Write a protein that binds this ligand. Structure first.
Ligand code: 9LL
Length: 267
């Protein structure tokens, strides 16, 4: 439930997974005080600019992150306060889903792929229920705990291609706007990590959306599935399918993946 405050001694950071302007992420081992067991963890350290106002804002968000409780939604285990701010999240061994599909493109299966979409939709629904807008749904932001299990992280805090036209044009973010991002995320999985609008300038993208052009239907997927992706990118936000609704369609599709999705040779 609550977010633990962690003593510096409690955890050690083994290696650095990623570097960002906002913060640098590390892979680490955390041993809870009073517990024999050692847990692998992902640690994020804010790069700079600590401010009293900033610290309060950061803390406030941290509590909510800790509060979230869903199987497909990442939860912030704890925060460590010292000179720098570090956020502790349980490590996902596999890494980002986008990276996973990219190096495992040859061996992936439709059932796994269809199942991932359902899981993301389920995760998204919890956020909608909790009145949280992710604001940056992407393939990278989906973490692979295991092939069978996937989770969503970094919600609640630009990626022009991923974001909805409404958001781009008027800086408007809503759950429906997140659905447009969700459709793009599905496209990434379907296309095995191909970058959307590859070689296209960010500035141009808004005009293209206005023109009705959309990302190309993936070779692997069936016609019905492509329609779901298109629905997400439709201009009317209300017209776009609800997340709860999305779960049902994918789940039905999940039962017989081969019909809906055709890739290589599969059972
Ligand atoms: O912790 C996060 N990412 C990490 N990378 C390596 C280890 S944790 C990320 C986050 C974690 C989570 F469980 C769920 C949603 C999230 O958005 N958060 C949370 C938070 C709170 C206050 C200020 C900044 C951040 C921030 O960046």
């Amino acid at each position: 439930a609550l977010l633990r405050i962690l003593k510096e001694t409690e955890f050690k950071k083994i290696k650095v997974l990623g570097s960002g302007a906002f913060g640098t992420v590390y892979k680490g081992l955390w041993i809870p005080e009073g517990e024999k067991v050692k847990i692998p963890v992902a640690i994020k350290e804010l790069r700079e600019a600590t401010s009293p106002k900033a610290n309060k804002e950061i803390l406030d968000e941290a509590y909510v992150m800790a509060s979230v409780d869903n199987p497909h939604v990442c939860r912030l285990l704890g925060i460590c306060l010292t000179s720098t701010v570090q956020l502790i999240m349980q490590l996902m061994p596999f890494g980002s889903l986008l990276d996973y599909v990219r190096e495992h493109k040859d061996n992936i299966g439709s059932q796994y792929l269809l199942n991932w979409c359902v899981q993301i939709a389920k995760g998204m629904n919890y956020l909608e229920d909790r009145r949280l807008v992710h604001r940056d749904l992407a393939a990278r932001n989906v973490l692979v705990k295991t092939p069978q299990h996937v989770k969503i992280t970094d919600f609640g805090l630009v990626p022009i291609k991923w974001m909805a036209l409404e958001s781009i044009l008027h800086r408007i973010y809503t759950h429906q706007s997140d659905v447009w991002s969700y459709g793009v995320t599905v496209w990434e999985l379907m296309t095995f990590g191909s970058k959307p609008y590859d070689g296209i300038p960010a500035s141009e993208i808004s005009s293209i959306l206005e023109k009705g052009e959309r990302l190309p239907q993936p070779p692997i997927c069936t016609i019905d599935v492509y329609m779901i992706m298109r629905k997400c990118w439709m201009i009317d936000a209300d017209s776009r399918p609800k997340f709860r609704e999305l779960i049902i369609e994918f789940s039905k599709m999940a039962r017989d993946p081969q019909r809906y999705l055709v890739i290589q040779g599969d059972e």
